[PDB]
Amino acid sequence: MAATQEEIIAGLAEIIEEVTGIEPSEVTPEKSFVDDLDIDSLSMVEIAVQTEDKYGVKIPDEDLAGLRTVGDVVAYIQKLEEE
């Protein structure tokens, strides 16, 4: 129940690659989806859809807007895993 931060980023970066094309070398826990990675709000929706399909992590719409950095998504997934 303790999927590590590196493991979550590794699984998230290979979805970000397929959605956008950004290499997992660029997906670091301090990058902003809008500013640094340039991932619009409609690509985040499919990142979340594929995350739920692959790892079972469900992220609703109201909470998906408040995840600005990759670290925010990792923290959300870890806090959801903690239960």
Partner 1 sequence: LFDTLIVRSFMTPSIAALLGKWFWWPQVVRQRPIPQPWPSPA
Ligand X SMILES: CC(C)(COP(=O)(O)O)[C@H](O)C(=O)NCCC(=O)NCCS
Interface ranges with ligand X (CB under 6 A): 40-42, 45, 61
Active-site residue identified among 35, 36, 38, 40: 40
For ligand X, give the closer residue by CB, 5 or 41: 41
Distance of CA 36 to the CA centre of its chain: 14
Partner whose footprint covers residue 7, from partner 1, ligand X, none (CB < 5 to 8 Å by kind): partner 1
Q: Which of 51, 43, 42, 54 is nearest to 73 (CA)?
A: 51
Instruction: Please confirm, yes or no, whether 40 is among the known catalytic residues.
Output: yes
Residue nearest to ligand X (CB): 41
Cα 26-83-16 angle, rounded to 5 deg: 20
